[PDB]
Amino acid sequence: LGLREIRIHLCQRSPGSQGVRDFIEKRYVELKKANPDLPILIRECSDVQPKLWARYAFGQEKNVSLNNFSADQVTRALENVLSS
Amino acid sequence: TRPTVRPRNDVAHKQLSAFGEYVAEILPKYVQQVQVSCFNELEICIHPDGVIPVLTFLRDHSNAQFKSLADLTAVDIPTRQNRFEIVYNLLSLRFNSRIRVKTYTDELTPIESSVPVYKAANWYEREIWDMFGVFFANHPDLRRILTDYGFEGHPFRKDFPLSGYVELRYDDEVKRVVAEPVELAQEFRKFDLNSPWEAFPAYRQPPE
Amino acid sequence: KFIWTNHKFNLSGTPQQYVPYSTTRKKIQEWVPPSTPY
């Protein structure tokens, strides 16, 4: 509409992606402490380019990427779409 | 053991150890393995390079005649990573013996004709081009024998489903005898015979 | 007993040429729809 859902893909290893793993430590419990409506999704492993995905407006897919970041870089990368 | 079991004979198995010992001695540029079949026959594993060369040594000599070429053939094995196989088979009229010469290959790699060495590999090489697909270069002629003019599949290899891909039938709508895809009246049942327990201990494959 | 009395032949059409058939019970037993009521 949107949006609708947010899917944070990641990997278990290749620590170059660790920001996401760190992002959960940083903002998940807090980030989703509000928005008690959005059903953001952690699924498992794209092993490479842990593309964040999001879906809205009659099911149109919009895929940002991330490759090697820090902790707060992604925290601010999420509200890019979430404010909209 | 005697009554029903085939009595063996040793003498034949001593010599064909010797006489085959030293044809790994005098042509080591080529021959890569040799052995003795328990029934007193020899198998010489030869690189594909020597084919015209080795026979030519077997073609004439005073210690090995092998003038009579009997049977050329092939075998095609998947999971040998070089598919096909040749097996030459030669009888030496003076010395009363059989010695077979195994040479591997692939489809793409050519092999070189034996035709100037023996003139009886003239047909046996035309055939194989039809069936398996091996391509023999420098052959006075290469054509289609044993097969129709339509088979584009090279059957006897292991990928041709037994019934070929086009049945034939004649129709009077015009005046030809034309070809429509194969439609059977019975499944060709597939039975399954291979029983467990490995009744042969001697051939036991490596432990792994 | 359990064998004939006279005989027969191999005939071309007698009228009876026997023209074989299938000897078996049915297969999938299709469904019957429900009757008159809604």
Partner: protein
């Protein structure tokens, strides 16, 4: 890959070759078309030849492009002579065989799960 090539070396003498025997086909379609006493529009005979040579287009390699030839070099033996009787030839152009749908919704009403 190390094995001796057959005729060509890389792609040029090879693709000089396929250009070549084209003409032996292109120059001789029709002498047959009167010889077997088969009747067709002689231009068909020049469409098929050019319909086939454009078919296998993606070939990346020598000794493949030489392999196909050794087939193609043969046929001109039989056809330019008469070793076929009308019915080994015309089988190229399939007259009797009912069409295949190849589209979607035409399948779905006839045939299970191709």
């Amino acid at each position: 890959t190390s094995v001796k090539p057959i005729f060509s070396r890389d792609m040029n003498e090879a693709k000089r070759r396929v250009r070549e025997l084209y003409r032996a086909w292109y120059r001789e379609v029709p002498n047959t078309v009167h010889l077997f006493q088969l009747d067709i529009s002689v231009k068909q005979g020049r469409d098929k030849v050019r319909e086939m040579f454009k078919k296998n287009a993606h070939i990346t390699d020598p000794r493949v492009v030489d392999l196909l030839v050794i087939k193609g070099k043969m046929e001109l033996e039989e056809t330019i002579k008469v070793w076929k009787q009308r019915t080994h030839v015309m089988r190229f152009f399939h007259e009797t065989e009912a069409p295949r749908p190849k589209d979607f919704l035409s399948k779905f009403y006839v045939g299970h799960d191709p």
